[PDB]
């Protein structure tokens, strides 16, 4: 028996969690075993580990006539609300109030977060992933390549064009070949973020292709005329070979390939994990120095940082109507908002990846000195996964290096980070419109943008038809619904 047990008799539940198009829940995970030990609740995964697309798998599960006891993953928020309203998911409100003191307290101290996860009916159908921190992504460049080529860090877009062109052309990696790739990212969408240099938003938040607000008016960054003029230039950059050709494909291995292979000259990514590589590959790539830079002055004469760490990502887990133990499950969920739960869901397992020192969790030296980023290590273990849990920034601070920290402070002091878009409150009726057209519209937008980047389609020629397609596919209808949600709340 343990003091954190939510049940006397051991309880085993069926979870469907397939997330980030990469991982599924593993009951054989060390963190899962620890969670079972402390909660007396074992979660057994039912999902295809051979599957690729996670969203697809969720949609298939919901239509298969049988639901598991718990469903979890990333970017299911809208689906949590929809299928919660349709009865696929149970309201957790009474369960939280009676059986979940930690979550209840959390929501009391965070009315904004709770508001963000609520459905139009006022119900909470899932327990969210709650991030901890302020800044998220920043621009990183190779200082050693700048020094070998005797170049100064670019203060502006033009200077960066010239620098990436120098990266493209004469041997920054010194192998006598043209093989070098100036810009790389593990996230394809970041290529669109390049439009920031031309004065266009690619998003309103950390969520890609999210809406934003300008002067009391709701806009989508991709539907704006400025976006066209920026995308022209990014398509030029791809055409000139400055952007990684595989940027839409390569994804999760990108850094490891391009930086490890000494091909990559520039990126835009999270401070900590990006800075880890300086220590990691320093033996394989002797001169490698990757440093944080302030965003270059863009064409509009401003310094934009579009990304920030957010409050309540649209990720987490929910309890189905077929779950025969709702109380035990809500207690179990509440565990992850307690101290021990946060400890295992953040730091992995004690005696393995971390120890308790002075009442705080301290990573093992074996973990900290590993060439692989700590968070990746944790993913592979079942930690830092988008279940309902409360993130602890200390976990990240432990592997955050001084240069990284100084980059963070540089971005904080300069106020470069743009205000993030938190959301709007729709009623049951209008949200139906949103949910009907939005996923497909977003898909279409992505496809089009990818067509433009790779140069398979001319942006200028297709812009008109693209706008028309946006209207006929219901984007602007959704936009009016979003606006009607906005103007009621905020007046003066």
């Amino acid at each position: 028996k343990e003091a954190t047990w939510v049940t006397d008799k051991p309880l085993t539940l069926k979870i469907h969690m397939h997330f980030r198009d990469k991982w599924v829940w593993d009951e054989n995970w060390p963190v899962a075993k620890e969670s079972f030990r402390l909660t007396n609740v074992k979660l057994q995964s039912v999902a295809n580990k051979a599957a690729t697309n996670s969203q697809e798998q969720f949609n298939l599960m919901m239509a298969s006539g049988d639901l598991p006891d718990v469903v979890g993953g990333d970017n299911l928020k809208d689906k949590f609300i929809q299928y919660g309203q349709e009865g696929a998911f149970v309201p957790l409100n009474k369960l939280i109030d009676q059986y979940a003191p930690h979550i209840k307290a959390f929501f009391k101290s965070h009315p904004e977060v709770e508001r963000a996860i609520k459905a139009p009916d006022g119900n909470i159908y899932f327990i969210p992933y709650v991030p901890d921190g302020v800044v998220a992504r920043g621009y990183f460049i190779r200082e050693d390549w700048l020094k070998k080529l005797n170049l100064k860090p670019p203060q502006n877009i033009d200077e960066l064009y010239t620098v990436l062109k120098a990266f493209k052309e004469k041997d920054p990696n010194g192998n006598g070949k043209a093989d070098e790739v100036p810009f790389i990212d593990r996230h394809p969408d970041e290529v669109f973020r390049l439009v920031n240099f031309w004065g266009a938003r690619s998003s309103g938040s950390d969520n890609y292709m999210d809406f934003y607000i300008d002067n009391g008016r709701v806009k989508h960054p991709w539907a704006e005329t400025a976006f066209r003029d920026g995308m022209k230039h990014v398509a030029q950059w791809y055409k000139e070979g400055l952007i990684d050709k595989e940027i839409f494909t390569r994804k999760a291995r990108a850094r490891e390939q391009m930086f490890g292979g000494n091909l990559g000259g520039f990126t835009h990514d999270w401070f900590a994990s990006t800075m880890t590589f300086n220590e990691g590959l320093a033996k394989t790539v002797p001169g490698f120095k990757l440093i944080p830079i302030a965003p270059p002055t863009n064409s509009k004469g401003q310094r934009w940082e579009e990304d920030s760490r957010q409050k309540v990502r649209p990720d987490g887990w929910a309890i189905t109507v077929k779950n025969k133990n709702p109380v035990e499950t809500i207690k179990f969920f509440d565990f992850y908002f307690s101290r021990p739960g946060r400890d295992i869901s953040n730091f992995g397992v004690p005696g393995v990846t971390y120890d308790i020192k002075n009442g705080k969790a301290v990573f093992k030296d074996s973990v900290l000195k590993s060439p692989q980023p700590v968070n990746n290590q944790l993913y592979d273990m079942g930690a830092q996964i988008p279940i309902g849990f409360w993130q602890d920034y200390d976990y990240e601070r432990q592997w955050t290096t001084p240069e990284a920290q100084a980059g963070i402070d540089m971005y904080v002091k300069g106020k470069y980070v743009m205000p993030g878009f938190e959301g709007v409150n729709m009623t049951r009726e209008e949200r139906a419109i949103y949910d009907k057209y939005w996923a497909d519209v977003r898909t279409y937008m992505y496809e089009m943008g990818q067509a433009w980047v790779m140069g398979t389609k001319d942006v200028d020629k297709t812009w008109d038809e693209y706008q028309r397609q946006l209207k006929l596919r219901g984007l602007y209808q959704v936009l009016q619904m979003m606006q009607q949600a906005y103007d009621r709340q905020y007046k003066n």
């Binding site: 697809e56 949609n59 050709k245 595989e246 992505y446 790779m454």
Partner: protein, 284 residues
């Protein structure tokens, strides 16, 4: 009458026929009633909804296109391979060719796809490398909608053309030599032979195989496409079978899908009827 007697006699034998008939009813004929259901009833409207899609109409427009290319390049190739092997002396050399040419058939379609993606990858794939050797620069193949069909039909001939050549080869092997020897006495030439004897004698085989080939003509390249089609190639690559799959299974839209499936199936039956007619009529 006669029946009962026979049956009383044609049982143990009549027993064997039953499970096969049970099977066909259950896994084949029972789904046709499902055809009838997914066809709260109606219906015939989502047929006109399926009629109007800018993505769909281009999928049939792509379908019959790919059918055209597969008929042009794909079909005559195993006949060609058949004739070319039959003209080979040297015994084992020919043998050596056959084992080489037949082997790709046994390579799985998904593995074929993987061979393609690994060969055509930019900066990695051997093909692009060989292009960089002679100064052809590089091309990212799977993303380009221009390259989809050539890559496909070519990979398909590589995989299936020899195994498909086997049949025709056997057919031309079944011709009694007397036709050839007597032709040689009159002084025919090898080309004169394949044009004036081998091909005309093998025609009934190629006509029969063509009407089967036409039977599936609308489903050509399904597993390949479903594997390799990227967003940028969605336009050229998407075919009726794929559309049906995406909406019906993936997108979980059944009725509209099943209906599209009907359209496809009826058109296939029609084209195989129109095939078999002209075939049996004109060729023997």
């Amino acid at each position: 009458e006669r029946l009962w007697k026979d049956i009383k006699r044609d049982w143990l034998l009549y027993a064997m026929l039953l499970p096969t008939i049970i099977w066909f009813l259950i896994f084949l004929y029972k789904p046709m009633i499902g055809l009838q259901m997914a066809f709260p009833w109606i219906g015939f409207d989502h047929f006109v909804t399926l009629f109007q899609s800018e993505q769909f109409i281009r999928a049939i427009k792509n379908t019959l296109t790919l059918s055209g290319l597969s008929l042009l390049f794909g079909f005559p190739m195993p006949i060609l391979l058949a004739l070319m092997i039959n003209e080979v002396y040297s015994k084992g050399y020919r043998k050596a060719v056959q084992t080489i040419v037949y082997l790709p058939h046994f390579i799985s379609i998904v593995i074929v796809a993987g061979l393609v993606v690994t060969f055509l990858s930019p900066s990695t794939g051997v093909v692009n490398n060989m292009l960089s050797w002679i100064g052809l620069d590089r091309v990212y193949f799977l993303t380009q909608p221009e390259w989809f069909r050539p890559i496909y039909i070519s990979s398909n001939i590589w995989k299936e053309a020899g195994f498909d050549s086997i049949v025709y080869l056997a057919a031309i092997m079944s011709i009694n030599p007397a036709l050839y020897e007597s032709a040689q006495v009159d002084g025919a030439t090898r080309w004169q032979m394949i044009t004036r004897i081998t091909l005309p004698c093998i025609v009934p085989t190629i006509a029969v195989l063509l009407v089967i080939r036409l039977g599936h003509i609308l489903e050509v390249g399904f597993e390949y496409i479903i594997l390799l089609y990227q967003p940028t190639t969605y336009e050229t690559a998407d075919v009726i079978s794929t559309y049906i799959y995406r909406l019906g299974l993936q997108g979980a839209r059944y009725d509209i899908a099943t209906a599209a499936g009907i359209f496809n199936a009826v058109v296939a039956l029609v084209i195989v009827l129109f095939a078999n007619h002209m075939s049996r009529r004109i060729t023997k």
